[PDB]
Amino acid sequence: LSLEEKIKLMRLVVRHKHELVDRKTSEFYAKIARIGYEDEGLAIHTESACRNQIISIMRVYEQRLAHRQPGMKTTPEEDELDQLCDEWKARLSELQQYREKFLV
């Protein structure tokens, strides 16, 4: 994916973030793949391929966080993608916290 495509994809993920239900990932990533194709011109992705793109974006995000330097000058596109990733990370963590509260 180009940077522009990654941003379009993560904009969709974040816009729909409240639609992800714990243990119902398939419906969510399938919907994201579909809207990304239909509305943002992404290639046709299987569910797994779409989810893998997001997994990779988030892994790269964690690497970017680990390698941040105080005083670095950044671009608006990298700032937007990082902000979207922060918001998605927070949603995944929220779901994890709710699951952990009621573990058997």
Domain segments of the chain: what residues? 1-104
- Structural resolution in Å: 1.0
How were these coordinates obtained? X-ray
Q: CB neighbours of 82 closer than 8 A, spacing ≥ 6?
A: 61, 64
Question: How many CA atoms are closer than 13 Å to the CA of 59, on its beta-carbon side?
Answer: 6
Three-state SS annotation for the chain: CCHHHHHHHHHHHHHCHHHCCCCCHHHHHHHHHHHHHHHHCCCCCCHHHHHHHHHHHHHHHHHHHHHCCCCCCCCHHHHHHHHHHHHHHHHHHHHHHHHHCCCC
CA–CA gap between residue 94 and residue 88 (Å, rounded): 10
Among 10, 31, 2, CA closest to 81: 10
User: CA torsion angle for 7, 66, 90, 9 (degrees, to 10)?
Assistant: 10
Q: At what angle do helices 76-100 and 47-67 cross, to 10 degrees?
A: 110
What are residue 41's phi and psi, to 5 degrees? 70, 20
